């Protein structure tokens, strides 16, 4: 099995910059390869075959170049559009294998959070449990980290966060986290914190309400 | 033109065998390879090994020899592929995609057309269907309100969230979901400009396809 290294694993530049992405090979692959493009949630489409060949279709702003054991995928004028993973391909020797990926992001202005907690549903509630849900929206970069605090003591126990990808239109990011208690725990406290921390802001993000006030 | 419709998303017990299809359509099917890519939780991906939908001959990546085995059916355009004794290591999207036509001489073995993929979970989790909650705001009166739902304890993936029938679309937020203890839970957002709630309908929609269950949650103050 031929190994194929991608590097970065990650990249961010901004809307009109060139970008190069690299794959090296533990083989000479005489340029045998080809590269992919996936957005997130699609199939994989062809950008690049035998090294160098733009597939009809693609965007000529997309080269690639390389010979030996090492390959390169090159954007010219970076589109919001080109936010996805890409992905090298040897076809060399049997078995065909791929790198482990690069994510290309768009930078661009910081953007504080907009940042929206919510009380457990009556629904909820009926059936025993208690779910405090905190929105962290449209902010950039997307580093970030949240902490949930009761009554002012942080709580770990219980959170669960995901993030969406990259915003199509403003290249913001999202988070969503979910602290799930019981209804009886839930009952035993007042004051449910959302707290972030985000280089858009010196201080801890707060994000409260009181049960009830 | 060209498109690569494949099956539909699958749950299958952890000793159990699964077969995938994959339908062509807009050239001649049988004029080109078609292969077979695993596709990780992980995001990487690895080549299964190929199938000439012509002559039936073969070749596979020599990590999958006791896992696949690919077959043909030439009078409906169609390719499959069969996983069998599954483990966990299996749970994934599987891709079919086509290479280049049986005629090249040239040595070029890229895939230009990418099925729509089928994802395969593998475990012995029960299927369960969503539990809906609404997100309202206690504050009245921003010039922006942000309205949510939470949709907690549903196995197994995927569920599809939309805001009153897709025609809500721009400032929504769908998180993807988390696991824990063999349940989900996925959240989405929607910011409204607060003269059109609550004075207009606002509700989430959410499919659960593997439990057979849509939910409608309309979102109402307090």
């Known amino acids: 099995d031929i190994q194929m290294t991608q590097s970065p694993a990650s990249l961010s530049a901004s809307v009109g910059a060139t970008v190069t992405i690299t794959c090296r090979t533990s083989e000479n692959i005489d340029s045998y390869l080809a590269w992919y493009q996936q957005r997130q949630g699609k199939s994989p489409q062809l950008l690049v075959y035998a090294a160098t060949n733009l597939a009809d279709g693609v965007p000529s702003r997309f080269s690639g170049s390389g010979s030996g054991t090492q390959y390169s995928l090159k954007i010219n004028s970076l589109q919001s559009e080109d936010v996805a993973r890409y992905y090298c391909?040897?076809?060399?020797?049997?078995?065909?294998?791929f790198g482990g990926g690069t994510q290309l992001e768009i930078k661009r202005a910081d953007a504080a959070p907009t940042v929206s907690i919510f009380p457990p549903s009556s629904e909820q509630l009926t059936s025993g449990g208690a779910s405090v849900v905190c929105f962290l929206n449209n902010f950039y970069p997307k580093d970030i980290n949240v902490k949930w605090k009761i009554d002012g003591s942080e709580r770990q126990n219980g959170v669960l966060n995901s993030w969406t990808d990259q915003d199509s239109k403003d290249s913001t990011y999202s988070m969503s986290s979910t602290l799930t208690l019981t209804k009886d725990e839930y009952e035993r406290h007042n004051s449910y914190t959302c707290e972030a921390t985000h280089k858009t802001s010196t201080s801890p993000i707060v994000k409260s309400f009181n049960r009830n006030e | 033109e060209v498109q690569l419709q494949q099956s539909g998303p699958e749950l299958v017990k952890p000793g159990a065998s699964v077969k995938i299809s994959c339908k062509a359509s807009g050239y001649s099917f049988t004029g080109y390879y078609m292969n077979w890519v695993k596709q990780s939780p992980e995001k990487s991906l690895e080549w299964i090994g190929e199938?000439?939908?012509?002559?039936?001959?073969?070749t596979y990546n020599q990590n999958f020899k006791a896992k696949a085995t690919l077959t043909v059916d030439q009078s409906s355009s169609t390719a499959y592929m069969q996983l069998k004794s599954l483990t966990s290591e299996d749970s994934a999207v599987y891709y079919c995609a086509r290479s280049v036509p049986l005629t090249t001489l040239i040595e070029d073995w890229y895939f230009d057309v990418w099925g729509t993929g089928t994802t395969v979970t593998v475990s012995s989790a029960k299927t369960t269907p969503p539990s809906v909650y609404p997100l309202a705001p206690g504050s009245a009166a921003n010039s922006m309100v942000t309205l949510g739902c939470l949709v907690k304890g549903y196995f197994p993936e995927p569920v599809t969230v939309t805001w009153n029938s897709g025609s809500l679309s721009s400032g929504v937020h769908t998180f993807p979901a988390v696991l824990q203890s063999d349940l989900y839970t996925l959240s989405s957002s929607v910011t409204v400009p607060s003269s059109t709630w609550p004075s207009e309908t606002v509700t989430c929609n959410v499919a659960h396809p593997a439990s057979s269950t849509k939910v409608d949650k309309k979102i109402v103050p307090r």
């Open positions: 199938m000439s939908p012509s002559t039936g001959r073969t």
């Open positions: 391909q040897h076809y060399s020797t049997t078995p065909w294998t």
